A paper describes a structure:
All NPPs share a conserved zinc-binding catalytic domain (phosphodiesterase or PDE domain). NPPs hydrolyze pyrophosphate or phosphodiester bonds. In this extensive study, we determined the crystal structure of [name] from [name] in complex with a phosphate ion and various nucleotide ligands allowing us to characterize the substrate recognition of nucleotide triphosphates, dinucleotides and nucleotide sugars by [name]. Similar to NPP1 and NPP2, the structure of [name] consists of two major domains, which interact via a large interface of 1279 Å2.
We determined a complex structure of NPP3T206A with the dinucleotide [name] using the same protocol as described for AMPNPP. One adenine base of the compound is bound in a similar manner as observed before for bound AMP. Major differences are observed in the ribose conformation, which is 2′-endo in the [name]-bound structure, whereas it is 3′-endo in the AMP- and AMPNPP-bound structures, and in the coordination of the α-phosphate group. This phosphate is coordinated with one oxygen to Zn2 and the oxygen which would be opposite of the T206 nucleophile is coordinated to Zn1. In contrast to the AMPNPP-bound structure the β-phosphate group is not coordinated to Zn1 but is hydrogen-bonded to N227, which is thus not bound to the α-phosphate group. In this orientation, the β-phosphate group is not positioned opposite to the attacking nucleophile for an in-line phosphoryl transfer. It follows that the observed binding mode is catalytically non-productive. Nevertheless, we speculate that the binding mode of the secondary (“leaving group”) nucleoside moiety resembles that in a productive binding mode. It is located in a binding pocket formed by the loop region of residues N477 to G484, which includes three glycines (G480, G481 and G484). Gly480 and Gly481 are in close contact to the adenine base, whereas Gly484 is not in near distance to make any interaction with the bound ligand.
Numbering used by the authors: 140 to 146, 151 to 473, 477 to 581, 587 to 871
Write the structure that this text describes.
C-alpha cells in the first residue's frame, strides 16, 4: 500500500462505506507540516487524501474534553466533560481516571456518534475512546474495550480488522481507534525532540498496519478513514512557572494546576457557592507588569471559548500565556497542553481518506465541533442536537448527504415610517446648534432607500430569528439599522466605510447635539434624561456620526434611535476603535462593511437572552444594559474590490467585546489607548456564528453563494 500510487471501490457485502475514526493523541499540526516526509504511511494519506492546514480543538486543550467533543459535536460545557479531573457539587463526587467515577454515566451528557448510529439501526465498535468504555445514556457500543494503555498498536489494529471480517449482520459500520503517542513522548522531552520523532514513526507504522490490513481485505479504497488528534503540544520550563504564593499570604483555596487553572473552595459542598470567586480574580488582576497569566470570572472569558455554562466549571479561571504554567506553590521540564485553542502549538491534525472524501485536497482550518455532523453524513444518519454548523464541512465530501438552507425569519419589519418632520416629544434631548428641517434627510424616497440598501446592506439585512420581536428598519444615507422597539435601542447597525484618503485630519463628533427620531414613537424611544440619573452608565453611539459624509451627514446619527447604554470606561475603548482602529482596518481592506449591536447574555449560555433573563437596566428605566457589544467587519477577499461591489468570496473579522464597568482586563494604568485597546478587541475575536447565537440574527442571506460556502465564512475564526 505505501509503495502503491494514489487511487466507490467497495467489495461484495459492503453496500455502505465503513467509517474509522483514528485518534493519535497530542499529534500537533506542526508535526505533519515539518516531519510528514519521515512518516511514509501518513505522508501517502496526506498526498492522496484530504487534509486541513490544522483542526482547532476546544478549550481546555486536554484529552477527555476534546475526544468527547469530536464524537458529540458539543462544547465541554454541554457534554459535561470539562476536564479529566473535575468536581460536581450536586453529585458530590470527584471525576478522575484513577477513580471508579470515570465509568459513572452521570458525568457524560449529550449523544456520542456510536449511540447516534445504534439508535438509527447501524452497529458501532470501539477500540479505545473516552466514553466508549462507559454506559453513556445506559448503553455501550456493540463491541468495546475497557481501557488498557500498554496494549501493542498491532493488537488494537488486528482486533479492528477482525471486526471488519465479521458477517454483515454482526459487522459494525462505525469504528473508533485511539493511540497514546506522540502525546506521551511530547510530555517527556517537548514537541521538538528525538523522542517525538520515534513516537511519530511508531504511530505511522500503526496506521500503515491498518492500511495494509484493509488492502488485504480490499477495503483500502472502500473505508472512509479520519486520522485526527485531540490537541497539540508546547514546550515547558521550570523557569516558566507562576506561583500563587507570590500573590497570596496563605492559600486556603483548591487549585487545578497547569495550563488551564480553576480555583474553588477546599470546603466542598458546604462553601462551593458562598466562596468569594470575585475576590480571587481581583486579588490576581494586574498584580505584576509582566504577569504570565490573566484571571477571569467564567462569564468574562472570551465568548468564542464557550467555557462557562456548567457547574463543574469553577467561576475563577486563569488564562496562562504561551509556554508558561500556573502552580499552587514552589512536572515543568518537558512539554504539555491545555492552553488557549487559538495558540498555534495547540492545533491538531486532520486527515481523511476514502470514496466519500475529495482526493488530493488541502482544506482551510476548521473546528472539532464540526466533525460530529460529518460522521453522521458519512454514516447516512440524522445528527442529535449539537454546536456544529451542519453543511459547513460539505466541501470535504464528493457528494454531500445534507444540503443546508437559510434560517427563516421569525419576525418581519413593521412601522417606523416617516410622517411629519416635527417631533411630538423632545424626549428631554437638546441640540442648540439647530435654529430643525434636517429631519427631511431621514425622509428617503424609493430610489434613496435602494441606494443605501445597495451600499450599506450589500449582503442583505440581518434576519431576525426571534419570534414576537417588535422591530423596524431605519434608513439613512450613510447607514441602515434594525431598531428594537421593546428595548428602545437598535439590534443591529449596518454601514460600509469607504477607503479613507488621509489619516492626518479627520472630522470630530458634533458635541452637545441630540434630538428625537420623528420616525420612532416616543413610548418606544430612549430619553436623554434616562442617562442623567445613572452615574455608571452614559449614552453612546452605535454608528459613529463623524465616520461618513460632512457635518450635515452627522445629524442623521445624532438621534435617540442611534443611542445605546454604555459604561464610561467601555466608551473609551468603543470611541478609540471607531476613531483610529476602524479607519486603519478600512485602509488595509479597501473599505469595510460594519455591523454592530448589543448582546444580552446574563445567564452566559452563549444564546440571546429572553426579556425575563436580563438582570441589569439603566437606573429607574426599562432600557436593558448589554453584557457584550458585537462588531462584525466584512470586506472582500480580493482587495481590488470594495465590500458593496464584490462578486467573489468575503473576508470577515467579528468581535464580541464585553461591556464591563472597568477596563481591569486590559491593565491600562498609565498606558495610552494605542497600547491596550486593539489588544482587548483582538482577545475577543469570535466567529459570525457566535455573534448569531448571542443576538438571534442571521447574516449574509442575500449573498449570491451556496449556503455551505456561507457556513464556512460563519464558522471561520480570524487568527493573527
Ligand atoms: N478511555 C480512557 N480511559 C482512561 N484513560 C485514558 C483513556 N484514553 C486515554 N487515557 C489516558 O489519557 C492520557 C493521555 O492524555 P493527555 O493528552 O496526556 O492529557 P489529559 O488526559 O487531558 O491530562 P493528564 O492529566 O493525563 O496529563 P498530565 O499533565 O497530568 O500529565 C501526564 C504525564 O505527563 C507528564 N507531564 C505533564 N506536564 C509536563 C511538563 N510540563 N513537563 C514534563 N512532563 C510533564 C507528567 O509527569 C505525567 O507523567 C494517557 O495517560 C492515557 O492512558
Ligand atoms: C450547544 O448545543 C447544545 C445542544 O443543542 C445546547 O444545549 C441545550 O440548550 C437547551 C437550551 O438552553 C437546553 O434545554 C438543553 O438541555 C441543552 N442541551 C445540552 C445537551 O446541554 C447548547 O446551548 C449549545 N451551545 C451554544 C453556545 O450554542
Ligand atoms: C469492562 O469491565 C467491567 C467491570 O469489570 C465489566 O463489567 C461486568 O460485566 C459482567 C458481565 O457482563 C457483569 O456481570 C458485571 O456486573 C459487570 N461489572 C461492572 C462493575 O460493570 C465489563 O464486562 C468489561 N468489558 C469488557 C469488554 O471487558
Ligand atoms: C474531592 O477531592 C477533594 C480534594 O482531594 C476533597 O477535598 C477535601 O474536602 C475536605 C472536606 O470534605 C476538606 O476539609 C479538605 O481540605 C479538602 N482537600 C483538599 C486537598 O482540598 C473532597 O473531599 C473530595 N470529595 C469526594 C466526595 O471524594
Ligand atoms: C437516551 O436514550 C433514550 C432511549 O433509550 C432516547 O430516547 C434519548 O433521546 C437518549 N438521550 C440521549 C441524550 O442520547
Ligand atoms: C481580483 O479580481 C480581478 C478581476 O476583477 C482578477 O483579475 C484578479 O486576479 C483577482 N485577484 C485575485 C488575487 O484572485
Ligand atoms: Ca442567554
Ligand atoms: Zn491528549
Ligand atoms: Zn498529554
Amino acid at each position: 500500500w505505501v509503495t502503491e500510487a494514489c487511487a466507490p471501490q467497495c467489495p461484495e457485502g459492503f453496500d455502505q462505506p465503513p467509517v474509522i475514526l483514528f485518534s493519535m493523541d497530542g499529534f500537533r499540526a506542526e508535526y505533519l507540516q515539518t516531519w510528514s516526509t519521515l512518516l511514509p504511511n501518513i505522508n501517502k494519506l496526506k498526498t492522496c487524501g484530504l487534509h486541513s492546514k490544522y483542526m482547532r480543538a476546544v478549550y481546555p486543550t486536554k484529552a477527555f474534553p476534546n475526544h468527547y467533543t469530536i464524537v458529540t459535536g458539543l462544547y465541554p460545557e454541554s457534554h459535561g466533560i470539562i476536564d479529566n479531573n473535575m468536581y460536581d457539587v450536586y453529585l458530590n463526587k470527584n471525576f478522575s481516571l484513577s477513580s471508579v467515577e470515570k465509568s459513572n454515566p452521570a458525568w457524560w451528557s449529550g449523544q456520542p456518534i456510536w449511540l447516534t448510529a445504534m439508535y438509527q439501526g447501524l452497529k458501532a465498535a470501539s477500540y479505545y475512546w473516552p466514553g466508549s468504555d462507559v454506559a453513556v445514556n445506559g448503553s455501550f457500543p456493540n463491541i468495546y474495550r475497557n481501557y488498557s494503555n500498554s496494549v501493542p498498536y498491532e493488537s488494537r489494529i488486528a482486533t479492528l480488522l477482525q471486526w471488519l471480517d465479521l458477517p454483515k449482520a454482526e459487522r459494525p459500520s462505525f469504528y473508533t481507534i485511539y493511540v497514546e503517542e506522540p502525546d506521551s513522548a511530547g510530555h517527556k522531552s517537548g514537541p521538538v525532540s528525538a523522542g517525538v520523532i520515534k513516537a511519530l514513526q511508531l504511530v505511522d507504522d500503526a496506521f500503515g498496519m491498518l492500511m495494509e490490513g484493509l488492502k488485504q481485505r480490499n477495503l483500502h479504497n472502500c473505508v472512509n478513514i479520519i486520522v485526527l488528534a485531540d490537541h497539540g503540544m508546547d514546550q515547558t520550563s521550570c523557569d516558566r512557572v507562576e506561583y500563587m504564593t507570590d500573590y497570596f499570604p496563605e492559600i486556603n483555596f483548591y487549585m487545578y494546576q497547569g495550563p488551564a487553572p480553576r480555583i474553588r473552595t477546599r470546603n466542598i459542598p458546604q462553601d462551593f457557592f458562598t466562596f468569594n470567586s470575585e475576590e480571587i480574580v481581583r486579588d490576581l488582576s494586574c498584580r505584576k507588569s509582566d504577569q504570565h497569566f490573566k484571571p477571569y470570572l467564567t462569564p468574562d472569558l472570551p465568548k468564542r471559548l464557550h467555557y462557562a455554562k456548567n457547574v463543574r466549571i469553577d467561576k475563577v479561571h486563569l488564562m496562562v500565556d504561551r509556554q508558561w504554567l500556573a502552580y499552587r506553590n514552589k512536572n515543568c521540564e518537558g512539554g504539555t497542553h491545555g492552553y488557549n485553542n487559538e495558540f498555534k502549538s495547540m492545533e491538531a491534525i486532520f486527515l481523511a481518506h476514502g470514496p466519500s472524501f475529495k482526493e488530493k485536497t488541502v482544506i482551510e482550518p476548521f473546528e472539532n465541533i464540526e466533525v460530529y455532523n460529518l460522521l453522521c453524513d458519512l454514516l447516512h444518519i440524522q445528527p442529535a442536537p449539537n454546536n456544529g454548523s451542519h453543511g459547513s464541512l460539505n466541501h470535504l465530501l464528493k457528494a454531500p448527504f445534507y444540503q443546508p438552507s437559510h434560517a427563516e425569519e421569525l419576525s418581519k419589519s413593521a412601522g417606523c415610517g416617516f410622517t411629519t418632520p416635527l417631533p411630538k416629544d423632545s424626549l428631554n434631548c437638546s441640540c442648540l446648534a439647530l435654529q430643525e428641517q434636517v429631519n427631511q434627510r431621514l425622509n428617503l424616497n424609493r430610489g434613496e432607500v435602494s441606494a443605501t440598501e445597495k451600499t450599506n446592506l450589500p449582503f442583505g439585512r440581518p434576519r431576525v430569528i426571534q419570534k414576537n420581536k417588535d422591530h423596524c428598519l431605519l434608513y439613512h444615507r450613510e447607514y441602515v439599522s434594525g431598531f428594537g422597539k421593546a428595548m428602545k435601542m437598535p439590534m443591529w447597525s449596518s454601514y460600509t466605510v469607504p477607503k479613507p484618503g488621509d489619516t492626518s485630519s479627520l472630522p470630530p463628533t458634533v458635541p452637545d447635539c441630540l434630538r428625537a427620531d420623528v420616525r420612532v414613537d416616543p413610548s418606544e424611544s430612549q430619553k436623554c434624561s434616562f442617562y442623567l440619573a445613572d452615574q455608571n452608565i452614559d449614552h453612546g453611539f452605535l454608528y459613529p456620526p463623524a465616520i461618513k459624509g460632512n457635518n450635515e451627514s452627522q445629524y442623521d446619527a445624532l438621534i435617540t434611535s442611534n443611542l445605546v447604554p454604555m459604561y464610561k470606561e467601555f466608551k473609551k475603548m468603543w470611541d478609540y476603535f471607531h476613531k483610529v482602529l476602524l479607519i486603519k482596518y478600512a485602509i488595509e481592506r479597501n473599505g469595510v462593511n460594519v455591523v454592530s449591536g448589543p448582546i444580552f447574555d446574563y445567564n452566559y449560555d452563549g444564546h440571546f437572552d429572553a426579556p425575563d433573563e436580563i438582570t441589569n437596566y439603566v437606573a429607574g428605566t426599562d432600557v436593558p444594559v448589554p453584557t457584550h457589544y458585537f462588531v462584525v467587519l466584512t470586506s472582500c477577499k480580493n482587495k481590488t474590490h470594495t465590500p458593496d461591489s464584490c462578486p467573489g468570496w468575503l473576508d470577515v473579522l467579528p468581535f464580541v467585546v464585553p461591556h464591563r464597568p472597568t477596563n481591569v482586563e486590559s491593565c491600562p494604568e498609565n498606558k495610552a489607548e494605542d497600547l491596550w485597546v486593539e489588544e482587548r478587541f483582538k482577545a475577543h475575536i469570535a466567529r459570525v456564528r457566535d455573534v448569531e447565537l448571542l443576538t438571534g440574527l442571521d447574516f449574509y442571506q442575500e449573498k449570491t453563494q451556496p449556503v455551505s460556502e456561507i457556513l464556512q465564512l460563519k464558522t471561520y475564526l480570524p487568527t493573527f
